[PDB]
Amino acid sequence: MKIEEGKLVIWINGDKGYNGLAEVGKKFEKDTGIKVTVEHPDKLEEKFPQVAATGDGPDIIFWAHDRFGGYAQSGLLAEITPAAAFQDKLYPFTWDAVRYNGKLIAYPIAVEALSLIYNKDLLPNPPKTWEEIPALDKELKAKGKSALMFNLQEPYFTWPLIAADGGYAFKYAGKYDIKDVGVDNAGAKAGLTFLVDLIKNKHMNADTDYSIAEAAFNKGETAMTINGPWAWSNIDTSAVNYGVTVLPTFKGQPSKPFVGVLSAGINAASPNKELAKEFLENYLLTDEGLEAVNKDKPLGAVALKSYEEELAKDPRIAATMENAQKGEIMPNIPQMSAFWYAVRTAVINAASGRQTVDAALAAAQTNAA
Amino acid sequence: TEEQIAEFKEAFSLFDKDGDGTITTKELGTVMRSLGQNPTEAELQDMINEVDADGNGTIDFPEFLTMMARDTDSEEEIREAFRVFDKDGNGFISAAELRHVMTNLGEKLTDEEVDEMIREADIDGDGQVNYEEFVTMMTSK
C-alpha cells in the first residue's frame, strides 16, 4: 500500500522474478509477523524520487546500481550496515558498485555484462582475439556469411573494445574522480581505430544497430554478435546452435564491458530500516531466497558466491560473470549522462568517416563536463 | 514533458505509417478498421478537421501534439480501449486477445513478449487482465 511502520513495501521492475520475490516475503511473513508487499509499478525508477519522502514510496527499491548514485546524492537512500562477514558472502567487486561518497547504499543482487555470442555451426571455435576477426570475415564472406555483427550505434555496446587497451569513463578508494576522464588516452584511440578499420575494411557496417545485428545472428547470417543475457531468449527461439563466451582480447588485454548490478536500496524515509535489513540479509541474499526469485524469472549471474557457483554450471552464466569480472563498473555518478552523449557522438562520427578518430575522441574528452 | 513528447511521437507513427510527417484520412481509417471499427469517410474527415488547424487535409505532429494536450474523462477512452481488446466481452483480456489487436496494428511481438505483457499486467495472477488491472497500467503514464 503506502508505507506503514511494521510492514515492508518493495518495488522491483516488471521483468524480474517479482512473484519469486513475493514467495520470499511470504516465508518472511511466516517466520516473523511481518507482512511484505512486492509491487512492480511502471516507471518505478522515475517515480521513486518524486514520491520517496512523502510516504508513497517503498521501503525497498531494486534497480540497476547506476541510478542509485543520483538517489544517494538527493538523500533518498539509507546507509547500509552489513557486517564484514555478510559482505564476504558476495563477490568483492559487487560492493564497489553500491558505494556513494564511500558509504554502502544498496545490497548487490545480480550482475550482467556483454559477452561474445557465436554460432557453433559456423564457427566451432570462437576467436580469442579481436585481431584475428578480419581474417575470419574473409573466410566467412567467401561462404556467403560474415564474422561479426553487433550494435554500433550505442557506446554501451562498443565500449568493451574502446576500453580494452586503457580506456575508462572516470577513474575510481571508493569514490570517482570527475576530473580524470579516460576517453582520449592511447588505449581508447587504438580501440576505436580498430573498430573503425573494421568498418573501413568492410567487415562491419556503420549503420548496424540492435535490430539489424539481432536479426542477422538469429537467422544464421553472421558467426558472432556481442550481447547480454537479456538477448538469450530470442536466440533460443531462433534455434541457432550458439555459445556464449569471454569477449575477445585486444592487444593481449581483456575486453572491458560495462557492469550493471541489480541492487536493493533502503528508503531513507523508511521507519522499517531494521526489518528491511533483516529481510534482505538472510532471507533474500541466501541460496533459497535467490532461488525462489530465479525460478520465477532468471537473474543471470548473482552477487552471492555460493549460488553463483551453482548457476555458473551453465557456461553462459559463467561467461557473463567472467566478462563482468574483467569489466568496468558503470559509474553511478550523474556526469555519466555527459559521458554517454559525448561518446555516442564520437563513435558515430568516427565510424561514419569524415571524422578523425583522434579528433572525435578529443572532442568527446571535452564534452564530459 | 519531453519524455511524453516522444511517447506521443510514437503514437503519431502508428497513424503515419508512411512516415511523411502527416496523418491522412486514409491512414486514420486504416488504423480504425484494423481495430474492428466501421467509420465512414465523412466521420473520418470530421475526425481530422477537428485536429487540422491548417486547412490542408492532414494532421501534422504539432497539430497532433496541441490536441493531445487539450482531459476530464479519459476514463471513457480507457474503457473503450478495454472493450476493443476484450472482443468476446467476458471481462478479461487474454494473451490471444492481446496478440489479436497487436497483430492487427502491425506491432511485432514474439509469443514470449505477449505472455510477458500479460504476466506483468496480471496483478492477481489468474492469467488474464481484468478492467482494474488494465486501468492500473493505463494510468501509470
Binding site: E154, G228 | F8, V51, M137, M138
Partner: peptide
Amino acid sequence: DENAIRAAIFIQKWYRRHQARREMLEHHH
C-alpha cells in the same frame, strides 16, 4: 471529442510501455 483517436492511442500504450521497457533492458534506442 476525438474519442476514437484517443482510444486508439490508449490501445497502443500497452505496446509503447513494453517496447520502451525492453529497449532499456537491452540498453539501446
